[PDB]
Unconditional design. Structure first.
Length: 216
Protein backbone atom coordinates (compact mmCIF):
# COMPACT_ATOMS: atom_id res chain seq x y z
CA UNK A 1 0.00 0.00 0.00
CA UNK A 2 1.86 3.01 -1.35
CA UNK A 3 1.06 6.40 -2.92
CA UNK A 4 3.32 7.96 -5.54
CA UNK A 5 3.27 11.70 -6.24
CA UNK A 6 4.30 12.77 -9.71
CA UNK A 7 4.55 16.55 -10.12
CA UNK A 8 5.86 18.49 -13.11
CA UNK A 9 5.27 21.22 -15.76
CA UNK A 10 3.07 20.97 -18.87
CA UNK A 11 3.72 18.32 -21.52
CA UNK A 12 6.38 16.74 -19.32
CA UNK A 13 5.00 13.26 -19.98
CA UNK A 14 3.54 12.78 -16.49
CA UNK A 15 0.22 11.11 -17.49
CA UNK A 16 1.95 8.71 -19.90
CA UNK A 17 4.54 7.73 -17.32
CA UNK A 18 2.00 7.57 -14.52
CA UNK A 19 -0.07 5.07 -16.50
CA UNK A 20 2.83 2.69 -17.07
CA UNK A 21 4.09 2.85 -13.52
CA UNK A 22 0.58 2.26 -12.16
CA UNK A 23 0.21 -0.69 -14.52
CA UNK A 24 3.48 -2.31 -13.49
CA UNK A 25 2.69 -1.87 -9.79
CA UNK A 26 -0.94 -2.94 -10.10
CA UNK A 27 -1.94 0.53 -8.88
CA UNK A 28 -4.32 3.18 -10.14
CA UNK A 29 -3.31 6.30 -12.00
CA UNK A 30 -5.10 9.53 -11.13
CA UNK A 31 -4.67 12.43 -13.58
CA UNK A 32 -5.51 15.53 -11.52
CA UNK A 33 -5.10 17.81 -14.50
CA UNK A 34 -8.22 16.25 -16.00
CA UNK A 35 -10.12 17.46 -12.95
CA UNK A 36 -9.08 21.08 -13.31
CA UNK A 37 -9.75 20.91 -17.06
CA UNK A 38 -13.26 19.50 -16.43
CA UNK A 39 -14.00 22.36 -14.05
CA UNK A 40 -12.61 24.76 -16.69
CA UNK A 41 -14.97 23.12 -19.21
CA UNK A 42 -17.88 23.89 -16.87
CA UNK A 43 -16.52 27.44 -16.46
CA UNK A 44 -16.60 27.99 -20.24
CA UNK A 45 -20.10 26.52 -20.46
CA UNK A 46 -21.17 29.02 -17.78
CA UNK A 47 -19.98 32.05 -19.79
CA UNK A 48 -16.68 32.23 -17.87
CA UNK A 49 -18.41 32.97 -14.57
CA UNK A 50 -16.29 34.66 -11.91
CA UNK A 51 -18.35 33.01 -9.17
CA UNK A 52 -16.25 29.88 -8.64
CA UNK A 53 -17.86 29.11 -5.28
CA UNK A 54 -21.23 28.83 -6.97
CA UNK A 55 -19.75 26.90 -9.90
CA UNK A 56 -18.33 24.30 -7.55
CA UNK A 57 -21.45 24.18 -5.40
CA UNK A 58 -23.62 23.38 -8.39
CA UNK A 59 -21.27 20.79 -9.87
CA UNK A 60 -20.71 17.06 -9.47
CA UNK A 61 -17.43 15.55 -10.57
CA UNK A 62 -16.27 11.96 -10.34
CA UNK A 63 -13.23 10.17 -11.72
CA UNK A 64 -13.97 6.62 -12.87
CA UNK A 65 -11.89 3.95 -14.58
CA UNK A 66 -12.49 1.67 -17.56
CA UNK A 67 -11.33 -1.85 -18.44
CA UNK A 68 -7.91 -0.68 -19.57
CA UNK A 69 -7.84 1.25 -16.27
CA UNK A 70 -8.04 4.44 -18.32
CA UNK A 71 -9.48 7.40 -16.38
CA UNK A 72 -12.92 8.80 -17.22
CA UNK A 73 -14.16 12.16 -16.00
CA UNK A 74 -17.85 12.39 -15.18
CA UNK A 75 -18.94 16.01 -14.90
CA UNK A 76 -22.59 16.67 -13.97
CA UNK A 77 -23.32 13.07 -15.14
CA UNK A 78 -21.69 13.52 -18.53
CA UNK A 79 -18.51 11.81 -19.64
CA UNK A 80 -16.38 14.80 -20.70
CA UNK A 81 -13.08 12.87 -20.85
CA UNK A 82 -12.55 13.61 -24.54
CA UNK A 83 -13.29 17.38 -24.39
CA UNK A 84 -10.58 18.60 -22.04
CA UNK A 85 -7.65 19.38 -24.36
CA UNK A 86 -6.48 20.72 -27.71
CA UNK A 87 -9.21 23.34 -27.36
CA UNK A 88 -10.26 26.44 -25.37
CA UNK A 89 -10.06 24.54 -22.09
CA UNK A 90 -6.25 24.52 -22.33
CA UNK A 91 -6.21 28.34 -22.66
CA UNK A 92 -8.26 28.89 -19.50
CA UNK A 93 -7.38 26.02 -17.16
CA UNK A 94 -4.48 27.84 -15.43
CA UNK A 95 -6.75 30.72 -14.53
CA UNK A 96 -9.56 28.49 -13.22
CA UNK A 97 -7.11 26.24 -11.29
CA UNK A 98 -5.79 29.28 -9.44
CA UNK A 99 -9.13 29.88 -7.72
CA UNK A 100 -9.56 28.78 -4.09
CA UNK A 101 -13.02 27.14 -4.36
CA UNK A 102 -11.78 25.18 -7.37
CA UNK A 103 -8.66 23.85 -5.65
CA UNK A 104 -10.51 23.07 -2.41
CA UNK A 105 -13.10 21.06 -4.31
CA UNK A 106 -10.56 19.18 -6.38
CA UNK A 107 -8.07 18.49 -3.61
CA UNK A 108 -10.69 17.06 -1.27
CA UNK A 109 -11.74 14.65 -3.99
CA UNK A 110 -8.14 13.77 -4.73
CA UNK A 111 -7.37 12.89 -1.11
CA UNK A 112 -10.50 10.75 -0.87
CA UNK A 113 -9.32 8.86 -3.92
CA UNK A 114 -5.95 8.17 -2.29
CA UNK A 115 -7.09 7.48 1.30
CA UNK A 116 -6.52 3.74 0.85
CA UNK A 117 -3.24 4.35 -0.99
CA UNK A 118 -2.42 2.40 -4.14
CA UNK A 119 -2.53 5.58 -6.20
CA UNK A 120 -0.02 7.02 -8.66
CA UNK A 121 -1.21 10.64 -8.78
CA UNK A 122 0.24 13.26 -11.12
CA UNK A 123 -0.30 17.01 -11.01
CA UNK A 124 1.39 20.20 -9.79
CA UNK A 125 0.85 20.20 -6.01
CA UNK A 126 0.61 16.50 -5.26
CA UNK A 127 3.86 16.15 -3.32
CA UNK A 128 3.36 19.48 -1.58
CA UNK A 129 -0.34 19.75 -0.83
CA UNK A 130 -2.44 16.72 -1.79
CA UNK A 131 -0.27 13.78 -0.64
CA UNK A 132 2.29 15.41 1.70
CA UNK A 133 2.96 11.92 3.12
CA UNK A 134 3.33 10.14 -0.22
CA UNK A 135 5.83 7.29 -0.01
CA UNK A 136 7.55 8.60 -3.15
CA UNK A 137 7.48 12.12 -4.60
CA UNK A 138 8.94 12.65 -8.05
CA UNK A 139 9.43 16.04 -9.67
CA UNK A 140 9.67 15.61 -13.44
CA UNK A 141 11.36 18.29 -15.52
CA UNK A 142 12.61 18.97 -19.04
CA UNK A 143 13.36 22.07 -21.09
CA UNK A 144 10.42 23.97 -22.56
CA UNK A 145 11.79 23.23 -26.03
CA UNK A 146 12.11 19.53 -25.25
CA UNK A 147 8.56 19.36 -23.96
CA UNK A 148 7.19 21.47 -26.81
CA UNK A 149 8.82 19.20 -29.38
CA UNK A 150 7.47 16.07 -27.73
CA UNK A 151 3.94 17.52 -27.57
CA UNK A 152 4.21 18.59 -31.20
CA UNK A 153 5.30 15.11 -32.29
CA UNK A 154 2.51 13.44 -30.33
CA UNK A 155 -0.04 15.82 -31.86
CA UNK A 156 1.12 15.21 -35.45
CA UNK A 157 0.78 11.49 -34.65
CA UNK A 158 -2.69 11.71 -33.07
CA UNK A 159 -3.79 13.44 -36.26
CA UNK A 160 -3.71 16.93 -34.75
CA UNK A 161 -1.99 19.75 -36.57
CA UNK A 162 -0.28 22.22 -34.27
CA UNK A 163 2.10 25.14 -34.71
CA UNK A 164 5.35 24.54 -32.79
CA UNK A 165 5.85 28.18 -31.81
CA UNK A 166 2.32 28.50 -30.44
CA UNK A 167 2.73 25.21 -28.57
CA UNK A 168 5.98 26.34 -26.97
CA UNK A 169 4.56 29.76 -26.11
CA UNK A 170 1.41 28.33 -24.52
CA UNK A 171 3.34 25.72 -22.55
CA UNK A 172 5.66 28.41 -21.22
CA UNK A 173 2.75 30.68 -20.32
CA UNK A 174 0.88 27.91 -18.46
CA UNK A 175 3.96 26.83 -16.49
CA UNK A 176 4.70 30.46 -15.62
CA UNK A 177 1.15 31.08 -14.41
CA UNK A 178 1.12 27.80 -12.43
CA UNK A 179 4.48 28.58 -10.79
CA UNK A 180 3.47 32.11 -9.80
CA UNK A 181 -0.13 31.72 -8.64
CA UNK A 182 -0.83 32.51 -4.97
CA UNK A 183 -2.37 29.15 -4.04
CA UNK A 184 -0.40 25.87 -4.14
CA UNK A 185 1.85 26.88 -7.05
CA UNK A 186 3.84 24.25 -8.93
CA UNK A 187 6.98 23.64 -6.88
CA UNK A 188 9.19 20.79 -5.69
CA UNK A 189 8.50 19.31 -2.26
CA UNK A 190 11.50 19.14 0.07
CA UNK A 191 11.52 15.33 0.03
CA UNK A 192 10.89 15.03 -3.71
CA UNK A 193 13.39 13.63 -6.20
CA UNK A 194 14.14 15.56 -9.37
CA UNK A 195 13.90 13.54 -12.57
CA UNK A 196 14.93 15.01 -15.92
CA UNK A 197 13.02 13.28 -18.73
CA UNK A 198 14.96 14.83 -21.61
CA UNK A 199 16.40 12.33 -24.08
CA UNK A 200 14.78 9.41 -22.27
CA UNK A 201 12.37 6.82 -23.58
CA UNK A 202 8.89 6.70 -22.03
CA UNK A 203 10.09 3.29 -20.79
CA UNK A 204 13.42 4.49 -19.42
CA UNK A 205 11.77 7.05 -17.18
CA UNK A 206 9.25 4.46 -16.00
CA UNK A 207 12.14 2.11 -15.17
CA UNK A 208 13.86 4.84 -13.18
CA UNK A 209 10.78 5.56 -11.10
CA UNK A 210 10.24 1.84 -10.53
CA UNK A 211 13.85 1.63 -9.40
CA UNK A 212 13.11 4.27 -6.77
CA UNK A 213 9.92 2.44 -5.77
CA UNK A 214 11.81 -0.79 -5.16
CA UNK A 215 13.90 1.13 -2.64
CA UNK A 216 10.87 1.89 -0.54
N1 LIG B 1 -2.37 18.84 -9.54
C1 LIG B 1 -2.67 19.76 -10.45
C2 LIG B 1 -2.95 19.35 -11.80
C3 LIG B 1 -3.27 20.33 -12.69
N2 LIG B 1 -3.32 21.71 -12.32
C4 LIG B 1 -3.70 22.76 -13.33
O1 LIG B 1 -4.33 22.09 -14.42
C5 LIG B 1 -3.68 22.44 -15.66
C6 LIG B 1 -3.73 21.27 -16.60
O2 LIG B 1 -2.77 20.27 -16.21
P1 LIG B 1 -2.33 19.11 -17.18
O3 LIG B 1 -1.65 19.82 -18.40
O4 LIG B 1 -1.33 18.27 -16.46
O5 LIG B 1 -3.50 18.39 -17.77
C7 LIG B 1 -2.27 22.91 -15.20
O6 LIG B 1 -1.67 23.72 -16.19
C8 LIG B 1 -2.60 23.59 -13.91
O7 LIG B 1 -3.03 24.93 -14.11
C9 LIG B 1 -3.02 22.09 -10.95
O8 LIG B 1 -3.05 23.29 -10.60
N3 LIG B 1 -2.70 21.08 -10.06
Amino acid sequence: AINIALDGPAAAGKSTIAKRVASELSMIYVDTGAMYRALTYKYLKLNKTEDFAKLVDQTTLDLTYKADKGQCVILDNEDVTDFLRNNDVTQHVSYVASKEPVRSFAVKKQKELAAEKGIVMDGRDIGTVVLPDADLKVYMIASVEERAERRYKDNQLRGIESNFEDLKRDIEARDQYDMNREISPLRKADDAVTLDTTGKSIEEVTDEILAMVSQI
